[PDB]
Amino acid sequence: VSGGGIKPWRQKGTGRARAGSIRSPIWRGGGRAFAAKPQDWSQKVNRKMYRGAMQCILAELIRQERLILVEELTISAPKTKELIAKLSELNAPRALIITKEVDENLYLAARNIPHVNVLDTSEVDPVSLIAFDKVIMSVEAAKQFEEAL
Amino acid sequence: ARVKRGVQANRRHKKILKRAKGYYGARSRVYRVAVQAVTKAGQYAYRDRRNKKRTFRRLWIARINAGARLNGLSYSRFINGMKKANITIDRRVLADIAMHDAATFGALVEKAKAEL
Amino acid sequence: MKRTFQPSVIKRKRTHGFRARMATKKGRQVLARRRAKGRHRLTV
RNA sequence: GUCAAGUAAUGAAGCGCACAUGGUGGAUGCCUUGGCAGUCAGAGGCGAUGAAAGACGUGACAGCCUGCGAUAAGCUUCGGGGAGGCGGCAAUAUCCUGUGAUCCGGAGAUUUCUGAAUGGGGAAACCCACUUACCAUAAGGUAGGUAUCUUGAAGAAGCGAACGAGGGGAAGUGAAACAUCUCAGUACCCUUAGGAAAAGACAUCAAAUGAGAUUCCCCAAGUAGCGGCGAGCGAACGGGGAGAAGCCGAUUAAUGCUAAUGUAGAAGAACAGCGUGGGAAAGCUGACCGUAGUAGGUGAUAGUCCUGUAUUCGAAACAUUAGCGUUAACAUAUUAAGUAGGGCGGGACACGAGAAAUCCUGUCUGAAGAUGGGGGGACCAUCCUCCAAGGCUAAAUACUCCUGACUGACCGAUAGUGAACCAGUACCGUGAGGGAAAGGCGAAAAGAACCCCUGUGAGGGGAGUGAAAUAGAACCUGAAACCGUGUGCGUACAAGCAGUAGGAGCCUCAAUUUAUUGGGGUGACUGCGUACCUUUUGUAUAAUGGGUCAGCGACUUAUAUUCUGUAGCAAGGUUAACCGUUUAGGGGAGCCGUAGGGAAACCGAGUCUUAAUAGGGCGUAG
RNA sequence: CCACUGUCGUUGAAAAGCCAGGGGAUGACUUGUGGAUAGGGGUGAAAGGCUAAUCAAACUCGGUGAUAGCUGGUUCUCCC
RNA sequence: GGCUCAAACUAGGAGCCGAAGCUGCGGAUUUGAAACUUGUUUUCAAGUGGUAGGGGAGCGUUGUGUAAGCCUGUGAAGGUGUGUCGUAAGGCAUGCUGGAGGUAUCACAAGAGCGAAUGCUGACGUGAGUAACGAUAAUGCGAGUGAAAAGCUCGCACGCCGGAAGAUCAAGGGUUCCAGUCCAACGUUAAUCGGGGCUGGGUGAGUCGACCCCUAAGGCGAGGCCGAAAGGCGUAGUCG
RNA sequence: GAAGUGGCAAAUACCAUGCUUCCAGGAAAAGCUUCUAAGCGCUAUAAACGAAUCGUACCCUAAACCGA
RNA sequence: UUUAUUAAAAACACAGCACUCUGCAAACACGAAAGUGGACGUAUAGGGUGUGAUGCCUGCCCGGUGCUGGAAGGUUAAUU
RNA sequence: AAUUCCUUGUCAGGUAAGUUCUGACCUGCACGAAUGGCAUAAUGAUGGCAGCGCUGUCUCCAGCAGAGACUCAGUGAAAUCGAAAUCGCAGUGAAGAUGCUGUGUACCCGCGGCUAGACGGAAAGACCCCGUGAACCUUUACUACAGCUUUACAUUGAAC
RNA sequence: GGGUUCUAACUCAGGUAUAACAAUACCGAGGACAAUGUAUGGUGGGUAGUUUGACUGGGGCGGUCU
Ligand SMILES: [Mg+2]
Numbered sequence A: 001v002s003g004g005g006i007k008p009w010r011q012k013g014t015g016r017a018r019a020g021s022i023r024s025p026i027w028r029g030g031g032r033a034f035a036a037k038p039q040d041w042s043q044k045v046n047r048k049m050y051r052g053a054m055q056c057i058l059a060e061l062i063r064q065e066r067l068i069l070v071e072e073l074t075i076s077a078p079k080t081k082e083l084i085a086k087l088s089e090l091n092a093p094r095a096l097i098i099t100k101e102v103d104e105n106l107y108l109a110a111r112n113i114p115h116v117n118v119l120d121t122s123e124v125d126p127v128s129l130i131a132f133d134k135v136i137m138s139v140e141a142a143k144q145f146e147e148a149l
Numbered sequence B: 001a002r003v004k005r006g007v008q009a010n011r012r013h014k015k016i017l018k019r020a021k022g023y024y025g026a027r028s029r030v031y032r033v034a035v036q037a038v039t040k041a042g043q044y045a046y047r048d049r050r051n052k053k054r055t056f057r058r059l060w061i062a063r064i065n066a067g068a069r070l071n072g073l074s075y076s077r078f079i080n081g082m083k084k085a086n087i088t089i090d091r092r093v094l095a096d097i098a099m100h101d102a103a104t105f106g107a108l109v110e111k112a113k114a115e116l
Numbered sequence C: 001m002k003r004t005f006q007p008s009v010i011k012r013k014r015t016h017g018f019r020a021r022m023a024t025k026k027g028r029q030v031l032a033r034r035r036a037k038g039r040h041r042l043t044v
Numbered sequence D: 001g002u003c004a005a006g007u008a009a010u011g012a013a014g015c016g017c018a019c020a021u022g023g024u025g026g027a028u029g030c031c032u033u034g035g036c037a038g039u040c041a042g043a044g045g046c047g048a049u050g051a052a053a054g055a056c057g058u059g060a061c062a063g064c065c066u067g068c069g070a071u072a073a074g075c076u077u078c079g080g081g082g083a084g085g086c087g088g089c090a091a092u093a094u095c096c097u098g099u100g101a102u103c104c105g106g107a108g109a110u111u112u113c114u115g116a117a118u119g120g121g122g123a124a125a126c127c128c129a130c131u132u133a134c135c136a137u138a139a140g141g142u143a144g145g146u147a148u149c150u151u152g153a154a155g156a157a158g159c160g161a162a163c164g165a166g167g168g169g170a171a172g173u174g175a176a177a178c179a180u181c182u183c184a185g186u187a188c189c190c191u192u193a194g195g196a197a198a199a200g201a202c203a204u205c206a207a208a209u210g211a212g213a214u215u216c217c218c219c220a221a222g223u224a225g226c227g228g229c230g231a232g233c234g235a236a237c238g239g240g241g242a243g244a245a246g247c248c249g250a251u252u253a254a255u256g257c258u259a260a261u262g263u264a265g266a267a268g269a270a271c272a273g274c275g276u277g278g279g280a281a282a283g284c285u286g287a288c289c290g291u292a293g294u295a296g297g298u299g300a301u302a303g304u305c306c307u308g309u310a311u312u313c314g315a316a317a318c319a320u321u322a323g324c325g326u327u328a329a330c331a332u333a334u335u336a337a338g339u340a341g342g343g344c345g346g347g348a349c350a351c352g353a354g355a356a357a358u359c360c361u362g363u364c365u366g367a368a369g370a371u372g373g374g375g376g377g378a379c380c381a382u383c384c385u386c387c388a389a390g391g392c393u394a395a396a397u398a399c400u401c402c403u404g405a406c407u408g409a410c411c412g413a414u415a416g417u418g419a420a421c422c423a424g425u426a427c428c429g430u431g432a433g434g435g436a437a438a439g440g441c442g443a444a445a446a447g448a449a450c451c452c453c454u455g456u457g458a459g460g461g462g463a464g465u466g467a468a469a470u471a472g473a474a475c476c477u478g479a480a481a482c483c484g485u486g487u488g489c490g491u492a493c494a495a496g497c498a499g500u501a502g503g504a505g506c507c508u509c510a511a512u513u514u515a516u517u518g519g520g521g522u523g524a525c526u527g528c529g530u531a532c533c534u535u536u537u538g539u540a541u542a543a544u545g546g547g548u549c550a551g552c553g554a555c556u557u558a559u560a561u562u563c564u565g566u567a568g569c570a571a572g573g574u575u576a577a578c579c580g581u582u583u584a585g586g587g588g589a590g591c592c593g594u595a596g597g598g599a600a601a602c603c604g605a606g607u608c609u610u611a612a613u614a615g616g617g618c619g620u621a622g
Numbered sequence E: 001c002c003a004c005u006g007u008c009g010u011u012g013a014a015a016a017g018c019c020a021g022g023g024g025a026u027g028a029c030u031u032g033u034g035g036a037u038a039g040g041g042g043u044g045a046a047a048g049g050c051u052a053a054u055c056a057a058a059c060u061c062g063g064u065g066a067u068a069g070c071u072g073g074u075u076c077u078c079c080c
Numbered sequence F: 001g002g003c004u005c006a007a008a009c010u011a012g013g014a015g016c017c018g019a020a021g022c023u024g025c026g027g028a029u030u031u032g033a034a035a036c037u038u039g040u041u042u043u044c045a046a047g048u049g050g051u052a053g054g055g056g057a058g059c060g061u062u063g064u065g066u067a068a069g070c071c072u073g074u075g076a077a078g079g080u081g082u083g084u085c086g087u088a089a090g091g092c093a094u095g096c097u098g099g100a101g102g103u104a105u106c107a108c109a110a111g112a113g114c115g116a117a118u119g120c121u122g123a124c125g126u127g128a129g130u131a132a133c134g135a136u137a138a139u140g141c142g143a144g145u146g147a148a149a150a151g152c153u154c155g156c157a158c159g160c161c162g163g164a165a166g167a168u169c170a171a172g173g174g175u176u177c178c179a180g181u182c183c184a185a186c187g188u189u190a191a192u193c194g195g196g197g198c199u200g201g202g203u204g205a206g207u208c209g210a211c212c213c214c215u216a217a218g219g220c221g222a223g224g225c226c227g228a229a230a231g232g233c234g235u236a237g238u239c240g
Numbered sequence G: 001g002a003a004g005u006g007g008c009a010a011a012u013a014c015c016a017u018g019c020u021u022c023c024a025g026g027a028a029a030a031g032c033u034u035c036u037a038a039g040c041g042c043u044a045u046a047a048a049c050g051a052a053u054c055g056u057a058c059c060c061u062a063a064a065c066c067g068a
Numbered sequence H: 001u002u003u004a005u006u007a008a009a010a011a012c013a014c015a016g017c018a019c020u021c022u023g024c025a026a027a028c029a030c031g032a033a034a035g036u037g038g039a040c041g042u043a044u045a046g047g048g049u050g051u052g053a054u055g056c057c058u059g060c061c062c063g064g065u066g067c068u069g070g071a072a073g074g075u076u077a078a079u080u
Numbered sequence I: 001a002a003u004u005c006c007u008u009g010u011c012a013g014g015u016a017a018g019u020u021c022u023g024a025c026c027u028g029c030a031c032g033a034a035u036g037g038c039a040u041a042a043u044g045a046u047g048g049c050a051g052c053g054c055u056g057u058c059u060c061c062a063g064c065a066g067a068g069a070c071u072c073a074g075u076g077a078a079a080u081c082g083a084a085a086u087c088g089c090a091g092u093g094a095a096g097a098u099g100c101u102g103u104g105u106a107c108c109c110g111c112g113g114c115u116a117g118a119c120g121g122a123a124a125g126a127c128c129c130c131g132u133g134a135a136c137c138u139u140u141a142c143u144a145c146a147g148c149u150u151u152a153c154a155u156u157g158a159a160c
Numbered sequence J: 001g002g003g004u005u006c007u008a009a010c011u012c013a014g015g016u017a018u019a020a021c022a023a024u025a026c027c028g029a030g031g032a033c034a035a036u037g038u039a040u041g042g043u044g045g046g047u048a049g050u051u052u053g054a055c056u057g058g059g060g061c062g063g064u065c066u
């Protein structure tokens, strides 16, 4: 904290509580006792623990019917309404669509739909798998998950 | 995540000051004094829950002694006569009878005096 | 009684003034420090 | 009716408690124009063509702030843009503007005085000049020149973040004292660069099947060592990565092309009805756009109202980055002697003289020179390796005064910058220096015409505005301490932590077929009862601390390590740095466990000691 | 110019004064203006005096959040 | 208090009072044991004063996710009452105020809880309407103006200084000077007055002073000497 | 729309940077007057014209300075 | 003369006295050095120390510790 | 005795009465000759003692004048302060009580005085002790260093 | 293995010239001394950094400490 180098008054004789700095943590405008600094919040999650948790999550999704296998999901034009129709027939308006090799116009069609995200199987995460109402996985992505886990 | 203490400190102090209602001077107004007065009030109340059971037996015994001496007996002979007659009436009820029903207390004294 | 501050303009400008500061390397460090703090009064 | 005796009630100068209603004050909540920490990029300077920092001016208009400089909130031009505008507080007036203003971007012109300040001097913003050319005739005007140093006309100077390299170099502290030692080659002082710097190609290591410059990261490893063998200090070899490069011109500065960038900009989808409401974005109903749906606003919460966003995009001028070409400045060793080595004193090596290699050098000396020399931790021999006494060299690494974009389990006005506000200000100090406080009406000023009291004051009451005025400018909310007014009850014969347990009476709400209960206020009278914290053997203590309130104020963070729980794998477990189109996937280097004994060699379910095969010691789920 | 005595004043009219007295008053005198000496240093007809109301080592900033076997304080609740 | 064949003492006897001890009744809780058996149920037994301190279980607060959710102008947060629920920390509802936000649940992270530190900042008390109003040179009255006059102006009288308490400067200050106007704040009271606010005005030099010419002390100092650097000294000079 | 000149007294101011004495032995430099060196204007008489710039208010034994 | 601001004195200074150093590039002092002061002085001078007008005066002790001179012997550094 | 502990030594003088003073003695705890001895005119806001004058210093205080204090009007502090419905006594008690016991006394509230108590306020006792605290000073404490000095080598040579 | 002499290093805070300071030239005086660097013995409160115990019917003094 700025300043604070001099003893505010002499130690004895003024009738005041002794002070060493005007920037002591006791004073208004003083430093923070245990001032925070930047922290690194990342954890080491074991490789097998991460893999087993993904396994557990996928099994639980099947067990509560929140996983939907499709042969493929290919949007032919970067158009939001096309994907909205294709998801309304699948009965998953709020969905995480996991496909291997996410197509560069299915991404555009999905970008603006609120509770819809499109992911490739390498960038799927546990929180994404848990957060969406439904998951629409292609059979190719299910095979990739078989191999990865 | 900075936490401000204002709202909780306020409601905390209001609980104490509310328990201090009716106290004199700083004891109902300022927290440093009210909080001691509330703690001391609780201490007195705890002690007097015990002491009230002693005070009321004291009162019952006094009233029974008066009632028995009206009938020609002391308390320490009347209670002995009840225990010898196998009368289980408690001092609270005996004092109530002595105060509010003089003829029934006369009958009880007669029973105790026949037992002696 | 006589007090500590007895003002004299020539003496003020000759011990603390701008040219007195600029005559020394240490006075120029005084000036650099005052300018870094952004003081509206560099020198008396 | 008299007298006598006895015994109630009523009192309030004031005070207490509760409630009601205010004042003060400015907490709280909400809010933000300001901060804080970073990421990914860029850039890393400005200045004799006069800088940073200032002084004084400059407007239709008094001050301050902002801009600007006697061409003075500005002048010219080139681009953008298209309807308002003449910077803010902060309006008013005269006006300008489709003959394109204000505004934005590139370039230019002007650019007082001070300050390196440079014609001399000086208490900065001042005083005094010399000289050349021209003009004037008077007592001057215009345009220049005149510092010092270095190099042979060209440069330099000064200022300013951090990071680099270099010359000097503490002490508090720790060692529970303290001197070796530590702190620490730190703080600080001084010098001087560059976008990085330094280092760098083996007179380097290794001892392996050898490798092959420098730098940085993870391990090796808190190991080997050093050390009043104390407190502490603390490698290397090598392994895994990032980055790679070797040369003898890997230089500097211009200019000119070609490309790209940046410095203004342009377009940019789609919503209605009804009800509530001051106001609709919220509710109900039904639509639409979406390569644009969690943006900021708009009178309450908006994909469709505005600015935006997705997407597509523009450059007359100037800058920057590259590639190319060319110029002009500097440089271009030819293999290295006062050198290597040595004596003495110091220093650096993790290593404190040590058995002390190796490096550096104040002093004194002083080779061999390839049939030679240096190193391999005293030293000798052998073997390996490499050629000092010439110079250079990108990247990977360090940083942030700054520019751009973006981010935050960062703050939200006692916080966050000292500074959200005319803050490095006021104020304090001779000075170096220290260093505040201080945000919020409302959606819009619609900021209250007029009337009344008053002194044409202050202040208020009406009227009016507004959804709201105990939103009225000291203006959101509006706590507490503290101070009033009103109502109810108590209180002027009674001794103390002021309560508590009982308890009469009164007052007030409700019931209830009607003075009884229930709730609330008060509390005559009785019992009991010496605050709190700290510190103590022990405190009502006449021991400490606190006038009160509000706000703030003290066991954290990082790493290492051990134990416990929990989860995953399990005789195995796990990767680090890194890479990665990045929480994944890869990366097995390393670490822990799986064996111990012994100083060690060494041996191993054993081993050590011993002559002993005896005895004995230590050993025989992570 | 000084400061010997006393009263007053001591939250002063004043962070050293007033009043009444007192001493030197051509001198080793007093005083103006400018300058010099700087912190383990200065200066001192010497009291450790004075060095800006600060002196047995000034002040400011920095090392620095010195160290403190000492003192104070250490904030919600209940159960064993 | 008072007590004398006691209300004293001695030796005996019988009653009774007396504690948070024991018993009775209701409730909670720790541990252990038995059985529908991770509170699923009932029991039983032994326990439950506590500083330093160890162990166990929770409450609230800020923030992140859950949450483009849910609540909210038919009124969020905050404030202030009341009622109610829990062993507690505390929760829930609601009247009034307020006027734009809040947040269930479960996890997660803390600037996470204050009465004390002669703690820090601000506000406000007590002392107390108390002490004091700053030289004991001194005032009285009549007019005027004014909302208002002890204090202003004018007048008369009185008093004080007069080697000053008058006048001119230097230093220092910087507009305080003069006029008009205003009285909130400032002035230790009031104020119509003012060194206060606001608006205007006012400083005229060949001779007065500065500047200028000159030098003292003492500075700076082409070259020069010295010094790790920074710098120190010093000639000519140049300032002063 | 008047007067305005005689006596006496009398400074620490002036003569006087003088005079007299003493010892502790009492700035400097320029302006100024002359002399020449290198080198190649000066003195009188006037007449006309000039003399810049800055300060100047006010307090100053104080209510304006140093002491909040 | 002095303890600015509780001590003014018997304290400090003082003229005078004595010892001792110093031959001048003095001794001595400031300074890292240059450069200074001493001093544009020169032993009738300059420094240090004590004492403190003046009058009468100033005794004894050289073992200790200093200082001055001496060097026969003992011991003794770097170096070699 | 500015020195003398014993000690107010002894003796003389001064007073009615003299631990001080003056003179003397010498038994100098523990004077003494330039850290000078013994005197000394003059001088001193210097120390002690004694007188005259003079007195409110006092016996023993009285009266008076002015400025405060007091009352009114205006302005308006201070330190302190856990909270106070804040009495005596004898006891008790962390050992000296407004606050506890017993008892006695006491209607409620000011103003002018006053200072016995509130171990009153003020200043984290300077005395004293403690801390393996600090500072500064001393020295034949230790360990260093500046400075001063010795010798060797260098600058540094020749001849006899 | 010591002296003596010399001058040419070195010194001059001597003279003359160079404006002055300084340097330089010459003269003069000294002279392998002095002086300075390195090393080394001595001296060294001139100056620094520090140490200087505890128990203890307070501390010191005394005593004690296994
Ligand atoms: Mg308000």
Ligand SMILES: [Mg+2]
Residues within 6 Å of the ligand: none
């Ligand atoms: Mg002083």
